[PDB]
Design a protein around this ligand. Structure first.
Ligand SMILES: O=c1cc(O)n([C@@H]2O[C@H](COP(=O)(O)O)[C@@H](O)[C@H]2O)c(=O)[nH]1
Ligand SMILES: O=c1cc(O)n([C@@H]2O[C@H](COP(=O)(O)O)[C@@H](O)[C@H]2O)c(=O)[nH]1
Lengths: 214, 213
């Protein structure tokens, strides 16, 4: 369970701006998604910086998509840096997912399995594999999933596959055109990035998001 | 064209060991693949350190696999850090690939498109998409590709799709069981990691790999 069903996608690329904006909306969220735009710009230490400053859960959105051996290394370094969870692509297959699950279990952290993506290009290859990727996750005991706000019927199908007990978060609301309300019919929380962090008043944008799903 | 058709996959996770081992084999290679194991352990500054210390080409193996907007940011940060090239997954589709191509063109760097992967799990979803992924790359003017040493007939088919002029590099030789010689029937260079960097004598391992080819 995530505060206000709202996860901030902090994809600003310098620490001052990222910390300032996160500080502006800190009252509205307790979970922040940090990805490569911020990490590759400021270093992995930025994760510990967020956890200390905001007391928030951090999901490391690294879309892990390598062979098992390399996946293990990526997960180890990421959890060592303090991430509570890591997002892993399902498309590379079950061995690559299991590698991540092993490290997460060892270290007491979580894996989120990325099924279908929210952007148009997801239609080409990912969409056709997505139901089976979700099922693979279920079969392996994965409990956390990511699916697209921009395709409510796909999101609904993924929820059907993973069951009511699995945790499902969903990006694509706001900038990419997804609707928070519709999305939360199926997802437990929505991921929101630009529509908050590029807003003239990010606190107002966050409050507005929450208001509309009150 | 890379020196000795051999690209070092430097996946050690601390600066001292990575720099030491790369130094031991610097005579045999002019191209190093640096990925997230090293970068997430030591920081993006490690790329510039490699380029200055070894004068090598650096391929940032980041398997970029996000939406276009995020892909653009990842490529910008990566090329800003000095990477000569970046490896991008094709599975997320054409828009995600074009986002990377845009930044690469802007900054005078290269994109390598990952088609099929070398590990067993690649059978599940990637293999069935790989020919079309390769074709997508061709249609977009991609000139650099990655394909698997572990599946020579797949690698051969990928070469057929991309044509003789495209540059194809291939991981999976050594630790994963691929054969350097067979692989180089189709790929322009092999990527080698553990069989060199975990070797008791990495210089001998590199020399040996080269001698066999
Ligand atoms: O299917 C996917 C999976 C993601 O993690 N994401 C990501 O979630 C975020 C979306 O942010 P935004 O609200 O600005 O569109 C980004 O960090 C992005 O990389 C995506 O948009 N679609
Ligand atoms: O299909 C793929 C694509 C890769 O980049 N790689 C990668 O290339 C390297 C292989 O190293 P090794 O020789 O130790 O198996 C690793 O860095 C790894 O992540 C892979 O092994 N198969």
């Amino acid at each position: 369970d995530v505060m206000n069903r709202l996860i901030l996608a902090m994809d600003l690329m310098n620490r001052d701006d990222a910390l300032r904006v996160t500080g502006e909306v800190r009252e509205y969220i307790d979970t922040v998604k940090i990805g490569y735009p911020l990490v590759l710009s400021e270093g992995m230490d930025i994760i510990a910086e967020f956890r200390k400053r905001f007391g928030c859960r951090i999901i490391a959105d690294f879309k892990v998509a390598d062979i098992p051996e390399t996946n293990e290394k990526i997960c180890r370094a990421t959890f060592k840096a303090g991430a509570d969870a890591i997002i892993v692509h399902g498309f590379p297959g079950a061995d690559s997912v299991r590698a991540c699950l092993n490290v997460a279990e060892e270290m007491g952290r979580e894996v989120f399995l990325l099924t279908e993506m929210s952007h148009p290009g997801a239609e080409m290859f990912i969409q056709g594999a997505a139901d089976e990727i979700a099922r693979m996750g279920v079969d392996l005991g994965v409990k956390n999933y990511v699916g697209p706000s921009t395709r409510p019927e796909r999101l609904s199908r993924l929820r059907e596959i993973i069951g009511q007990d699995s945790f499902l978060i969903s990006p694509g609301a706001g900038a990419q055109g997804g609707d928070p309300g519709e999305t939360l019919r199926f997802a437990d929380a929505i991921i929101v990035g630009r529509s908050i962090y590029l807003a003239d008043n990010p606190a107002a944008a966050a409050a507005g998001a929450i208001e509309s799903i009150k």
